């Protein structure tokens, strides 16, 4: 396509299926002369990661730490540059153009999530700050320096537009509610634990979530009961991502630095496992069209599709 680069950077960072079927790819260059990032659109999910069989493409100034789908055409990006930027899609969907680009964080913007409404988003960064964004107006409404270390992961609640989780290397997991005068609340499963790294809400119940620590232990938490209901030693390395399947009774996809994939029960028992990756597993995304189909990206530049029993 026009403007779409001839080549894509080796380190694939994120993979997200749009609700209609398309696949969004963010990839960074983490080695070599130029340290940059690129955004890709694949209307053929099986064509990935071939730069010649893509629908759209664009280069970004710096690498891609995290991204998210905003609606159906908008792409929200957490840039190494300390900037959060929104990328607008073409009406033809062959051109990816920049909407806004705001340098508001001081260090690398490391995590981003969109709130339920889809007009507001929340970004976490290494600068320790968390910021609430007006996407339509391209400004920061609220800035929260609540943690003591770099913010690892921020995850907006599925339905409540004012609620989100956030975890950091200061061993804090914070349940947020912008409605309160003190927005943050320290939700602790245990008083001493290995540092939280990944967060995922349950898609049905807005009162339960899961969190993976740096130790390879995925734990299931209830907000009200405030105790570790259940946990399992799923991985041998830092748990880097958690994704729930769109199923009625959903499965949990599990990412790590042991290059493996895990799909888990509601009681966190192991169903599926895949070492198809030779490098770190970076993201997971469930196919909207085929629920039993799951796509994973790595740093081994491999786009793999899994069939879940």
């Amino acid at each position: 396509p026009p403007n779409a680069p001839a080549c894509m950077e080796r380190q694939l960072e994120a993979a997200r299926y749009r609700s209609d079927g398309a696949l969004l790819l963010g990839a960074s260059s983490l080695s070599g002369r130029c340290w940059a990032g690129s955004l890709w659109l694949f209307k053929d999910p099986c064509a990935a990661p071939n730069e010649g069989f893509c629908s759209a493409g664009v280069q970004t100034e710096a690498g891609v730490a995290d991204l998210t789908w905003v609606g159906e055409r908008g792409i929200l990006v957490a840039s190494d540059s300390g900037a959060v930027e929104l990328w607008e899609l073409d009406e033809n969907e062959t051109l990816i153009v920049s909407k806004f680009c705001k340098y508001e964080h001081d260090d690398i913007v490391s995590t981003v999530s969109v709130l339920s409404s889809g007009t507001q988003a929340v970004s976490g960064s290494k600068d320790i700050c968390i910021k609430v964004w007006d996407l339509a107006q391209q400004v920061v409404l609220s800035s929260y320096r609540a943690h003591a270390a770099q913010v690892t992961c921020v995850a907006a609640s599925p339905h409540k537009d004012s609620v989100f989780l956030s975890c950091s290397e200061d061993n804090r997991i914070l349940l947020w509610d912008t409605r309160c005068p003190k927005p943050a609340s320290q939700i602790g499963c245990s008083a001493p634990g290995y540092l939280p790294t990944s967060l995922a809400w349950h898609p049905q119940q807005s009162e339960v979530f899961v969190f993976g620590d740096e130790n390879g232990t995925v734990s299931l938490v209830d907000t009200k009961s405030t105790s570790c209901v259940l946990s399992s030693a799923v991985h041998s390395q830092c748990v880097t991502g958690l994704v729930f399947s769109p199923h009625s009774v959903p499965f949990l996809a599990s990412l790590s630095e042991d290059c493996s994939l895990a799909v888990l029960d509601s009681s966190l028992s192991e169903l599926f496992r895949s070492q198809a990756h030779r490098d770190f597993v970076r993201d997971a995304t469930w196919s909207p069209l085929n629920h039993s189909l799951l796509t994973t990206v790595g740093w081994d530049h491999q786009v793999v599709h899994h069939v879940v029993p």
């Binding site: 340290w35 690398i108 030779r278």
Partner: peptide
């Protein structure tokens, strides 16, 4: 690269092909 975590002990991440950084 600040985000480029490297593994030194266990495979397969151990055997990541270079280059490890810019020249």
């Amino acid at each position: 690269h600040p985000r480029f975590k490297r593994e030194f002990i266990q495979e397969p991440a151990k055997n990541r092909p270079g280059p490890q950084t810019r020249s």
